[PDB]
Structure 1
Amino acid sequence: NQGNNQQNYQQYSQNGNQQQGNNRYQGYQAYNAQAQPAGGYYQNYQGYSGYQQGGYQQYNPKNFNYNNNLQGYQAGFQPQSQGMSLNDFQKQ
């Protein structure tokens, strides 16, 4: 093994659990607009975990732009540009 290496390794185990019954679950989701409502009856919850964004790795024994967007909000980007740019984010 020699050189660059980006490794994402996640080990998750949910095995050997007992959940008893007789449960009453009433879930009301209504009139949601541009939303992601989450809910429920859980015992073991593993979620939204293990995120890896790689980076610069240069191994040696013209405009470059690299953008990694994970679950993010990016608006109004003019990198390495020539001219005039107008970005208006007025909130009233």
Structure 2
Amino acid sequence: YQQQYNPQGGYQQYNPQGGYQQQFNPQGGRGNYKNFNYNNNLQGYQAGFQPQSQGMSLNDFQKQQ
């Protein structure tokens, strides 16, 4: 079993952009706001050696009883 990653040269720009500005933005409103959940996740790889790997794992969240 032989796994070989051998890059030569190259230009790599890794620029993921997440803009979350004013996620909660009511304008001129009247009322009540209860149980607001914001989950913002950014994950990634620039090149790299990662067999049998997992980027992001999320479970059991954002529940109201």
Is the structural similarity TM-score above 0.5?
no
Bigger relative contact order, structure 1 or 2 (CA pairs below 8 A, ≥6 apart): 2
Output the TM-score relative to the length of structure 2.
0.36
If you compute each CA radius of gyration, which structure gives the higher value, 1 or 2? 1
Output the TM-score relative to the length of structure 1.
0.30
Higher strand residue share: 2
